[PDB]
Amino acid sequence: TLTIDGKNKILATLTPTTIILHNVDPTADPTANKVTQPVAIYFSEPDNGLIASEDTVNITVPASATVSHYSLWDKCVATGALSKPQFFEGIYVISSVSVDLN
Amino acid sequence: TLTIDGKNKILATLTPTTIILHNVDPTADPTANKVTQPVAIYFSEPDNGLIASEDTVNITVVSHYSLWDANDKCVATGALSKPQIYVISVSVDLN
Amino acid sequence: GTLTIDGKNKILATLTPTTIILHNVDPTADPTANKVTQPVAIYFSEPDNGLIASEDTVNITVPASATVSHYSLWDNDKCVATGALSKPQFFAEEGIYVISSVSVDLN
Amino acid sequence: MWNPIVNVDITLNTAGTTREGFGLPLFLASTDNFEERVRGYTSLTEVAEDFDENTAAYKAAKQLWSQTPKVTQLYIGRRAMQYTVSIPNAVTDYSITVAAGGGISQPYQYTATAENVLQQFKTQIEADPTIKDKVSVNVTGSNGSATMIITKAGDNDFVKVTTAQTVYIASTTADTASTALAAIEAYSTDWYFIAAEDRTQQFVLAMASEIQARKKIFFTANSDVTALQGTELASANDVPAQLAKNMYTRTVCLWHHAAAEDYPEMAYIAYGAPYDAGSIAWGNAQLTGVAASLQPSNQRPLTSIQKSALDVRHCNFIDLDGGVPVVRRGITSGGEWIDIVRGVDWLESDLKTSLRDLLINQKGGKITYDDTGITRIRQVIETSLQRAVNRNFLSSYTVNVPKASQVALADKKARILKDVTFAGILAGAILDVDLKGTVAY
């Protein structure tokens, strides 16, 4: 039952520098199934135990590929499933991605 | 949904050093309601998102508690097992 | 043999395009073929030094799953200009294509 | 209305004088207390009205006006904000209020999972006759992990969210260094020094590169203990070490233990800002109220070894004389003295103004492309350089221009003059002294 101060101190040490998309679920194995190359992402300062990316991210999905999930790297620190899978070639737009302790 | 590696990264920096008990919940305000005096407590390394105390601290005299770090900032709060010498027969979890 | 600046200034005042349409093929052929988006209004300023510039930005809605590789300007419909976009773009989903500003020259 | 023949007012406060120099500071804070992205202030009192005592903007504004003579004016820039709204408990009333530019505010309400609650708000805003074109909304998450995102949209530049304890509201900066800087420049370009509240490694390095492409100076502090260890720049990886690696000459970094919540940089800015550019050495500066740099572990002044570690990183520090703290070197991360950078920027602005008086304002008529016109260009350039010599910034100079009979006839049709060059000799200054002597009968 951490207080807001503990959550803010904790989140200040997360430094996810890049993101990668996966067609297979990367939670079991985040090293394989790379769909797109690493793309830099930027994160804001913690507030009320939450952080979010400061700006939009654009990713080039290769030909005849599909995207299902994502994984953060800096080593890997997090993974998650996209709001909806999409069979495109094109540009996939990722809005703010938030990490929370609430 | 942080992985185990991320959680291990996190807990390593959140290191409390003392614990104080309160007669009233300190989550609303960690300053007042202090019944005891600062008592040192130590913790092991994180693992699977868990850090456990190395020894069962003994506190001299409440139904509440509040952890503190080395710079006078409260980091956790909650209620004890029973209201009422108190023996701290404790860990911090991200699950 | 060349038009003076006055001639160019007089000439440009008659070209009054008011809509812009996008295509996935070069509209140098029949200009109404391969239309990909609905027309969007666009305005131009007075001719100075034989050149006219767009007054403001224009937002064009690209239908989902469409592709854009070219464009054309239209008036009273006659297509007065054509050209290729800076890059063929694959809008996997609905999006916005922005024309910051476009100008017509006689030099 | 009726006025007294003589009106007199007396107060028991204390006041000091101001002075004018080159460049005014700007503080890039994360706040939403006002709509406009930049606002000016002429005293700590005015800052206190829109900011309380614990705000970062208040701390920085207080440090700046602790010197004498006081800076004439400070600007406070604003950073774009985004809000995340989520339900922290069970679902069984909920209401929020959203504000936008121009004072447009529209409250919303949905009296009853969490997802099914937020979707009600999203539809309401998108269906509102106004505000919908100005803001963007988004919802994601299932059942109990539902969340909402609200951000600036369209031409609207300002957005706020507030509230119903069943609704949890969070805020976070949305814009990066590049996007934020571009937005502010399009509104007000009257500022020279820039400092920022955010001190993350990612943000600071991004801002440093952006400023390197413009003509400004970016003052920042640092308190990373790893900067005090090692003496090889190649091996180091702390923030000051990375800055020196990239040879950024327009970024000034100051090491200070208290740089975590306080802003000692703004004190350093006020040391030289009041005075004219190029005629002041920034080393050996005395700052009022700023304590010497101390080791976090034991609160002792930094040792000689640790100071040498900062020297190879081109990082400033508050050394100690015999009881007097002083910022010693005052060099940028690129190894160039500050007064050199400031003087070059003032000179490069004076030259631009003088030339634009001829090209644009047309004093004495347009310039011909014969020897007559080129001699006029020589006169304006020489005058500006002589102004630098009067300040003691330089000591001499020379100017060279192409002969009108030798310029290629392709430039004559493009109306462009090239091959105009000059050189200057810096004046210099003294900061250290070395001495030896002997005693004998």
DSSP assignments along D172-189, one per residue: EE---HHHHHHHHHTT--
Residues B80 and B78: their CA atoms lie apart, in Å, by: 7
Asked whether D23 and D273 are in contact (CB, 8 A), the reply is: yes
Q: What is the DSSP letter of D226?
A: G
Residues D115 and D117: their CA atoms lie apart, in Å, by: 5
C24-31: long-range pairs with CB below 8 Å, 24+: C24/C66, C24/C67, C24/C68, C24/C69, C24/C70, C25/C69, C25/C70, C26/C69, C26/C70, C26/C82, C26/C84, C27/C70, C27/C71, C27/C72, C27/C79, C27/C82, C28/C82, C31/C72, C31/C74, C31/C79, C31/C82
Question: Smallest CA–CA separation between A3 and chain B, in Å?
Answer: 5
A vs C: CB pairs below 8 A: 13
Type of residue at D269: I
Residues A34 and A45: their CA atoms lie apart, in Å, by: 29
Query: Do the two chains C and D touch, given a threshold of 8 Å on CB pairs and at least 3 pairs?
Result: no
Residues D254 and D310: their CA atoms lie apart, in Å, by: 10
**Which pairing describes strands D193-196 and D25-29: parallel, antiparallel, or unpaired?**
parallel
Type of residue at B55: D
Provide the sign of the torsion angle of the four alpha carbons D57, D60, D65, D69, taken in this order.
negative
Resolution in A: 3.1
**Cβ–Cβ contacts within 10 Å for residue C98, how many?**
8
How many CA atoms are closer than 13 Å to the CA of D218, on its beta-carbon side? 27
Judge: A3–B74 Cβ closer than 8 Å, yes or no.
yes
Peptide bond preceding C88: is omega within 30 degrees of 0, i.e. cis? no
Nearest CA in chain A to D150: A96
* Residue D310 main-chain phi, psi, to 5 deg: -70, -30
What b/e string do you get for B11-26 counting C-beta neighbours within 10 Å, with b at 16 or more? beebebebbbbbeebb
Residues in contact with D245: Cβ distance below 8 Å, sequence separation at least 6, in sequence order: D233
User: Percentage helix, strand, coil, to 5, in chain B?
Assistant: 10, 35, 55
Judge: C90–A90 Cβ closer than 8 Å, yes or no.
yes
The tokens 């004890």 sit on which residue? B80
Residues C86 and C22: their CA atoms lie apart, in Å, by: 13
* Token pair in block for residue D163: 């509230």
Question: Smallest CA–CA separation between D149 and chain A, in Å?
Answer: 8
Residues D312 and D227: their CA atoms lie apart, in Å, by: 10
Judge: C90–A88 Cβ closer than 8 Å, yes or no.
yes
Type of residue at D282: W
| C-alpha to C-alpha distances, C55 to C94, D3, D16, nearest whole angstrom | 26, 52, 50
CA B49 to chain CA centroid, Å, is 15
The tokens 């600046």 sit on which residue? C5
Residues of B in contact with A82 (CB under 8 A): none
Residues D339 and D272: their CA atoms lie apart, in Å, by: 9
Residues of C in contact with A86 (CB under 8 A): 92-93
Tell which residue, A90, A81, A97, has the closest CA to residue A22.
A81
Dihedral angle over CA of D273, D224, D31, A39, nearest 10: 110
* Token pair in block for residue C59: 């937002």
Three-state secondary structure call for residue D59: helix
| C-alpha to C-alpha distances, D210 to C93, D182, D218, D326, D348, nearest whole angstrom | 33, 10, 10, 30, 20
Method: cryo-EM
The backbone region for C97, taken as left when phi is positive above 0, alpha when psi lies in -120 to 50, beta otherwise, is beta
Dihedral angle over CA of D372, D374, D379, D385, nearest 10: -170
Asked whether D154 and D134 are in contact (CB, 8 A), the reply is: yes
Nearest CA in chain A to B2: A78
Asked whether D327 and D283 are in contact (CB, 8 A), the reply is: yes
Residues D156 and D80: their CA atoms lie apart, in Å, by: 11
Residues D436 and D133: their CA atoms lie apart, in Å, by: 76
* Token pair in block for residue C11: 């000439």
Residues in contact with D335: Cβ distance below 8 Å, sequence separation at least 6, in sequence order: D249, D314
| C-alpha to C-alpha distances, C63 to C86, C90, D70, D153, D287, nearest whole angstrom | 19, 11, 58, 21, 62
CA B58 to chain CA centroid, Å, is 14
Strand partners, B93: B50
* Residue C87 main-chain phi, psi, to 5 deg: -165, 130
Residues C65 and C71: their CA atoms lie apart, in Å, by: 18
- For every residue of D351-419, which 3-state class applies, written as one string? HHHHHHHHHCCCCCCCCCCCHHHHHHHHHHHHHHHHHHHHCCCEEEEEEECCCCCCCCCCHHHHCCCCC
Asked whether B22 and B62 are in contact (CB, 8 A), the reply is: yes
Three-state secondary structure call for residue D148: strand
Residues D157 and D175: their CA atoms lie apart, in Å, by: 12
* Residue D83 main-chain phi, psi, to 5 deg: -120, 140
Q: What is the DSSP letter of D255?
A: E
Instruction: Please indicate if any CB of chain B lies within 8 Å of the CB of A31.
Output: no
State in Å, rounded, how far the first CA of chain C is from the last one.
13
Tell which residue, C103, C92, C38, C34, has the closest CA to residue C66.
C92
Residues A35 and A72: their CA atoms lie apart, in Å, by: 14
Question: Smallest CA–CA separation between A1 and chain B, in Å?
Answer: 6
Residues B95 and B19: their CA atoms lie apart, in Å, by: 22
Residues A93 and A97: their CA atoms lie apart, in Å, by: 11
Provide the sign of the torsion angle of the four alpha carbons C72, C73, C78, C80, taken in this order.
negative
Asked whether B88 and B60 are in contact (CB, 8 A), the reply is: no
Question: Smallest CA–CA separation between A94 and chain B, in Å?
Answer: 18
Q: Based on the number of CB atoms within 10 Å of its own CB, is C67 exposed (0-12), middle (13-18) or buried (19 or more)? A: middle
Residues C47 and C53: their CA atoms lie apart, in Å, by: 8
State in Å, rounded, how far the first CA of chain A is from the last one.
10
Residues in contact with B78: Cβ distance below 8 Å, sequence separation at least 6, in sequence order: A1, B27, B64, B65
**Residue of B6, B9, B76 with shortest CB distance to A6:** B76
Tell which residue, D204, D302, D283, D310, has the closest CA to residue D251.
D204
H-helix segments, chain C: 5-12
Residues of A in contact with C90 (CB under 8 A): 88-91
* Token pair in block for residue D147: 């969340």
* Token pair in block for residue C58: 């224009």
* E strand or H helix at D63: helix D56-64
Asked whether A75 and A38 are in contact (CB, 8 A), the reply is: no
* Token pair in block for residue D291: 């304590």
